Amino acid sequence: LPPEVNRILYIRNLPYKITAEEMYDIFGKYGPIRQIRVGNTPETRGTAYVVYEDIFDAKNAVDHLSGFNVSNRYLVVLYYNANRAFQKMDTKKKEEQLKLLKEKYGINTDPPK
Amino acid sequence: SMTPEQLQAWRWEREIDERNRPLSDEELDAMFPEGYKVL
Numbered sequence: 001l002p003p004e005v006n007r008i009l010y011i012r013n014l015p016y017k018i019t020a021e022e023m024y025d026i027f028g029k030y031g032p033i034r035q036i037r038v039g040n041t042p043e044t045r046g047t048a049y050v051v052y053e054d055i056f057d058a059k060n061a062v063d064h065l066s067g068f069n070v071s072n073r074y075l076v077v078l079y080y081n082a083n084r085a086f087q088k089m090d091t092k093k094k095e096e097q098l099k100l101l102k103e104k105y106g107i108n109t110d111p112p113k
Numbered sequence: 114s115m116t117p118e119q120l121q122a123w124r125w126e127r128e129i130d131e132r133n134r135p136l137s138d139e140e141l142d143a144m145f146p147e148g149y150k151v152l
């Protein structure tokens with residue numbers, strides 16, 4: 001599996017009123033879910049992070065859920081990218097966040113491919 | 114003794130294991146920006 005494959009999926013175009021149970025039904029179909037974080041601010045609502053326990057389940061969800069129809073709306077389902085994840089920070093404070101993550105955990109801090 | 118091909122399989126298994134290790138809650142939390150609620 002390609003390097004960009006990750007157990008964390010970043011979701012966009014998510015209905016505002018979707019429930020915790022609906023989130024677990026949609027994504028849980030693909031394997032044990034480690035955790036889900038739903039955006040709950042003006043800047044983040046409509047988006048979510050979905051974490052799988054296993055990487056091959058995460059690959060499978062991407063292959064099947066991109067453009068998935070839920071309440072007249074097609075989901076955008078993307079692999080986590082730390083660079084992307086911390087976009088909404090300023091130049092200096094972002095660089096430090098990415099530095100922390102690469103140093104302490106060894107995650108890729110490059111932009112998407 | 115493993116052939117070049119079997120070595121490459123062994124290598125993928127190792128790489129794949131490193132990418133499928135369990136994460137602490139501390140590691141996980143570090144991964145995410147503000148404005149998200151844990152379900």
Ligand SMILES: Nc1ncnc2[nH]cnc12
Pocket residue numbers: 010078079080081082084085086087
């Ligand atoms: N691929 C991605 N991963 C994480 N957060 C993001 N924000 C925008 N794109 C992202």
